Amino acid sequence: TEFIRFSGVVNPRTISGSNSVPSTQVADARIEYVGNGYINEAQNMGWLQRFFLNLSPM
Amino acid sequence: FGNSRADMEASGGNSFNGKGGANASNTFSGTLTVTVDQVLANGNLHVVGEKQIAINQG
């Protein structure tokens, strides 16, 4: 399952005639595109590898 | 001049080569919608804005 979430503030005069506004005209734009399932877990680092990436000398 | 009393031969050399340099550059391209949070005494507008995007794993 994939989730696309959007939030922001829109000026009414930036909305086009077809009730559309580009995402670059939204003030506090919060855009999120995430997923779950084993596909999403396959894109997470292992805990040991994350620990090393954060605490290894090099 | 007998017995090589005045015969002589000398050589000498001196060399120096120094150099240096530096360079910096930066580019930025994009679009962001900000909000006015203050109007100054001459009418100039203080603007602040933030865009947060989450794609997959960050």
Coordinates of all heavy atoms in Angstrom, one line a residue, chain A residues 3-48:
Chain A
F3 N 0.9 5.6 0.1 CA 0.2 6.8 0.5 C 0.9 8.0 -0.1 O 2.1 8.1 0.1 CB 0.1 6.8 2.0 CG -0.1 5.5 2.7 CD1 0.9 4.6 2.9 CD2 -1.4 5.2 3.1 CE1 0.7 3.4 3.6 CE2 -1.7 4.0 3.8 CZ -0.6 3.1 4.0
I4 N 0.1 8.9 -0.7 CA 0.5 10.2 -1.1 C -0.3 11.2 -0.3 O -1.5 11.3 -0.5 CB 0.3 10.4 -2.6 CG1 1.1 9.3 -3.4 CG2 0.8 11.8 -3.0 CD1 0.2 8.3 -4.0
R5 N 0.3 12.0 0.5 CA -0.3 13.0 1.3 C 0.2 14.4 1.0 O 1.4 14.6 0.7 CB -0.1 12.7 2.8 CG -1.0 11.6 3.4 CD -0.7 11.4 4.9 NE 0.5 10.5 5.1 CZ 0.3 9.2 5.4 NH1 -0.9 8.6 5.5 NH2 1.4 8.5 5.6
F6 N -0.8 15.3 1.0 CA -0.4 16.7 0.6 C -1.1 17.6 1.6 O -2.3 17.4 2.1 CB -0.8 17.1 -0.8 CG -0.4 18.4 -1.2 CD1 0.9 18.7 -1.6 CD2 -1.3 19.5 -1.2 CE1 1.3 19.9 -2.0 CE2 -0.9 20.8 -1.5 CZ 0.4 21.0 -1.9
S7 N -0.5 18.7 2.0 CA -1.0 19.7 2.9 C -0.4 21.1 2.4 O 0.7 21.1 1.9 CB -0.7 19.4 4.3 OG -1.6 20.2 5.2
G8 N -1.2 22.1 2.7 CA -0.6 23.5 2.4 C -1.7 24.5 2.5 O -2.8 24.3 2.9
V9 N -1.3 25.7 2.0 CA -2.1 26.9 2.0 C -2.2 27.4 0.5 O -1.1 27.6 -0.1 CB -1.7 28.0 3.0 CG1 -2.3 29.3 2.6 CG2 -2.0 27.6 4.4
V10 N -3.3 27.7 0.0 CA -3.5 28.0 -1.4 C -4.2 29.4 -1.5 O -5.2 29.7 -0.8 CB -4.4 27.0 -2.1 CG1 -4.8 27.5 -3.5 CG2 -3.6 25.7 -2.3
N11 N -3.6 30.3 -2.3 CA -4.2 31.6 -2.6 C -5.3 31.3 -3.7 O -5.1 30.6 -4.7 CB -3.2 32.5 -3.2 CG -3.4 34.0 -2.9 OD1 -4.1 34.7 -3.6 ND2 -2.9 34.4 -1.7
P12 N -6.5 31.8 -3.4 CA -7.6 31.6 -4.4 C -7.4 32.1 -5.8 O -7.9 31.5 -6.8 CB -8.8 32.3 -3.7 CG -8.5 32.4 -2.3 CD -7.0 32.6 -2.3
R13 N -6.6 33.2 -5.9 CA -6.4 33.8 -7.3 C -5.3 33.0 -8.1 O -5.2 33.3 -9.3 CB -6.0 35.2 -7.2 CG -7.2 36.2 -7.1 CD -6.8 37.6 -6.8 NE -6.4 38.3 -8.1 CZ -6.0 39.6 -8.2 NH1 -5.9 40.3 -7.1 NH2 -5.8 40.1 -9.4
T14 N -4.6 32.1 -7.5 CA -3.7 31.2 -8.2 C -4.3 30.0 -8.8 O -3.7 29.3 -9.6 CB -2.5 30.8 -7.3 OG1 -3.1 30.1 -6.1 CG2 -1.7 32.0 -6.8
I15 N -5.6 29.7 -8.5 CA -6.3 28.5 -9.0 C -6.7 28.8 -10.4 O -7.3 29.9 -10.7 CB -7.5 28.2 -8.1 CG1 -7.0 27.8 -6.7 CG2 -8.3 27.0 -8.7 CD1 -8.0 28.0 -5.6
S16 N -6.5 27.9 -11.3 CA -6.8 28.1 -12.7 C -8.3 27.9 -13.0 O -9.1 27.6 -12.1 CB -6.0 27.1 -13.6 OG -6.5 25.8 -13.5
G17 N -8.7 28.1 -14.3 CA -10.1 27.9 -14.6 C -10.6 26.5 -14.5 O -11.8 26.3 -14.4
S18 N -9.8 25.5 -14.6 CA -10.1 24.1 -14.5 C -10.0 23.6 -13.0 O -9.8 22.4 -12.8 CB -9.3 23.3 -15.4 OG -7.9 23.3 -15.1
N19 N -10.0 24.5 -12.0 CA -9.9 24.2 -10.6 C -8.6 23.4 -10.4 O -8.6 22.3 -9.7 CB -11.1 23.4 -10.2 CG -11.4 23.4 -8.7 OD1 -11.2 24.5 -8.1 ND2 -11.7 22.3 -8.0
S20 N -7.5 24.0 -10.8 CA -6.2 23.3 -10.6 C -5.2 24.4 -10.3 O -5.3 25.6 -10.7 CB -5.8 22.6 -11.9 OG -4.9 21.6 -11.6
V21 N -4.2 24.0 -9.4 CA -3.1 24.9 -9.0 C -1.9 24.0 -9.0 O -1.9 22.9 -8.4 CB -3.4 25.6 -7.7 CG1 -3.8 24.6 -6.6 CG2 -2.2 26.5 -7.3
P22 N -0.7 24.5 -9.6 CA 0.5 23.8 -9.4 C 1.0 23.8 -8.0 O 0.7 24.7 -7.2 CB 1.5 24.5 -10.3 CG 0.8 25.8 -10.6 CD -0.6 25.6 -10.5
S23 N 1.7 22.7 -7.6 CA 2.2 22.6 -6.2 C 3.2 23.6 -5.8 O 3.5 23.7 -4.6 CB 2.8 21.2 -6.0 OG 3.3 21.0 -4.7
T24 N 3.8 24.4 -6.8 CA 4.8 25.4 -6.5 C 4.2 26.7 -6.0 O 4.9 27.6 -5.7 CB 5.7 25.6 -7.7 OG1 4.9 25.9 -8.8 CG2 6.6 24.3 -7.9
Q25 N 2.8 26.8 -6.1 CA 2.1 28.0 -5.6 C 1.5 27.8 -4.3 O 0.7 28.7 -3.9 CB 1.1 28.4 -6.7 CG 1.6 28.4 -8.1 CD 2.3 29.6 -8.5 OE1 1.8 30.7 -8.2 NE2 3.4 29.5 -9.2
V26 N 1.8 26.7 -3.5 CA 1.2 26.5 -2.2 C 2.3 26.8 -1.2 O 3.4 26.4 -1.2 CB 0.8 25.0 -2.1 CG1 0.3 24.7 -0.7 CG2 -0.2 24.6 -3.2
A27 N 1.9 27.7 -0.2 CA 2.8 28.3 0.7 C 3.5 27.3 1.6 O 4.7 27.1 1.5 CB 2.1 29.3 1.6
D28 N 2.8 26.6 2.5 CA 3.4 25.6 3.4 C 3.2 24.2 2.9 O 2.5 23.4 3.5 CB 2.8 25.8 4.8 CG 3.7 26.8 5.7 OD1 4.7 26.3 6.2 OD2 3.3 28.0 5.8
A29 N 3.8 23.9 1.8 CA 3.5 22.6 1.1 C 4.2 21.5 1.9 O 5.5 21.5 2.0 CB 4.0 22.7 -0.3
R30 N 3.4 20.5 2.3 CA 3.9 19.3 2.9 C 3.5 18.2 2.0 O 2.4 17.9 1.8 CB 3.4 19.1 4.3 CG 4.3 19.6 5.4 CD 5.0 20.9 5.2 NE 5.3 21.6 6.4 CZ 5.9 22.8 6.4 NH1 6.2 23.4 5.3 NH2 6.2 23.3 7.6
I31 N 4.5 17.5 1.4 CA 4.3 16.5 0.4 C 5.0 15.2 0.9 O 6.1 15.2 1.4 CB 4.9 16.8 -1.0 CG1 4.6 18.3 -1.3 CG2 4.4 15.9 -2.0 CD1 5.1 18.7 -2.7
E32 N 4.2 14.1 0.9 CA 4.7 12.8 1.5 C 4.3 11.7 0.5 O 3.2 11.7 0.0 CB 4.1 12.5 2.9 CG 4.3 11.1 3.4 CD 4.2 11.1 4.9 OE1 3.6 12.0 5.5 OE2 4.7 10.1 5.5
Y33 N 5.2 10.8 0.2 CA 5.0 9.7 -0.6 C 5.7 8.5 0.0 O 6.9 8.3 -0.2 CB 5.5 9.9 -2.0 CG 5.2 8.9 -3.1 CD1 4.2 7.8 -2.8 CD2 5.8 8.9 -4.3 CE1 4.0 6.9 -3.7 CE2 5.5 7.9 -5.3 CZ 4.6 6.9 -5.0 OH 4.3 5.9 -5.9
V34 N 4.9 7.6 0.7 CA 5.5 6.5 1.4 C 4.7 5.2 1.1 O 3.7 5.2 0.3 CB 5.4 6.7 2.9 CG1 6.2 8.0 3.3 CG2 4.0 6.8 3.4
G35 N 5.2 4.1 1.6 CA 4.5 2.8 1.4 C 4.8 1.8 2.5 O 5.6 2.1 3.4
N36 N 4.1 0.7 2.5 CA 4.3 -0.4 3.4 C 4.4 -1.7 2.6 O 4.4 -1.7 1.4 CB 3.3 -0.4 4.5 CG 1.9 -0.5 4.0 OD1 1.5 -1.4 3.2 ND2 1.0 0.4 4.4
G37 N 4.4 -2.8 3.4 CA 4.6 -4.1 2.8 C 6.1 -4.4 2.8 O 7.0 -3.6 3.0
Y38 N 6.4 -5.7 2.4 CA 7.8 -6.1 2.4 C 8.7 -5.3 1.4 O 9.9 -5.3 1.5 CB 7.9 -7.6 2.1 CG 7.3 -8.1 0.8 CD1 8.0 -7.9 -0.4 CD2 6.1 -8.8 0.7 CE1 7.5 -8.4 -1.6 CE2 5.6 -9.2 -0.5 CZ 6.3 -9.0 -1.6 OH 5.8 -9.5 -2.8
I39 N 8.0 -4.7 0.4 CA 8.8 -3.9 -0.6 C 9.4 -2.7 0.2 O 10.5 -2.3 0.0 CB 7.8 -3.4 -1.7 CG1 7.4 -4.6 -2.5 CG2 8.6 -2.4 -2.6 CD1 6.4 -4.3 -3.6
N40 N 8.6 -2.1 1.1 CA 9.1 -0.9 1.9 C 10.1 -1.4 2.9 O 11.0 -0.7 3.2 CB 7.9 -0.2 2.5 CG 8.3 0.6 3.8 OD1 8.1 0.1 4.9 ND2 8.9 1.8 3.6
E41 N 9.9 -2.6 3.5 CA 10.9 -3.0 4.5 C 12.2 -3.4 3.8 O 13.2 -3.4 4.5 CB 10.3 -4.2 5.3 CG 8.8 -4.3 5.3 CD 8.3 -5.5 6.2 OE1 9.1 -6.3 6.5 OE2 7.1 -5.5 6.5
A42 N 12.2 -3.8 2.6 CA 13.4 -4.1 1.8 C 14.2 -2.9 1.6 O 15.4 -3.0 1.1 CB 13.1 -4.8 0.5
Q43 N 13.7 -1.7 1.8 CA 14.4 -0.4 1.6 C 14.8 0.3 2.9 O 15.1 1.4 2.9 CB 13.5 0.5 0.7 CG 13.5 0.2 -0.8 CD 12.2 0.6 -1.4 OE1 12.0 0.3 -2.6 NE2 11.4 1.3 -0.7
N44 N 14.7 -0.5 4.0 CA 15.2 0.0 5.3 C 16.5 -0.7 5.6 O 16.7 -1.9 5.4 CB 14.2 -0.3 6.4 CG 12.9 0.4 6.1 OD1 12.5 0.7 5.0 ND2 12.2 0.7 7.2
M45 N 17.5 0.1 6.1 CA 18.8 -0.4 6.5 C 18.6 -1.4 7.7 O 17.7 -1.2 8.6 CB 19.7 0.7 6.9 CG 20.6 1.1 5.8 SD 21.7 2.5 6.4 CE 22.9 2.5 5.0
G46 N 19.4 -2.4 7.8 CA 19.4 -3.2 9.0 C 19.9 -2.4 10.2 O 20.6 -1.4 10.1
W47 N 19.4 -2.8 11.4 CA 19.7 -2.1 12.6 C 21.2 -2.0 12.9 O 21.7 -1.0 13.3 CB 19.0 -2.6 13.8 CG 19.1 -4.1 13.9 CD1 18.3 -5.1 13.3 CD2 20.0 -4.9 14.7 NE1 18.7 -6.3 13.7 CE2 19.7 -6.2 14.5 CE3 21.1 -4.5 15.6 CZ2 20.5 -7.2 15.2 CZ3 21.8 -5.5 16.2 CH2 21.5 -6.8 16.0
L48 N 21.9 -3.1 12.7 CA 23.4 -3.1 12.8 C 24.0 -2.2 11.8 O 25.0 -1.5 12.2 CB 23.9 -4.5 12.7 CG 25.4 -4.7 13.0 CD1 25.6 -4.7 14.5 CD2 25.9 -6.0 12.4

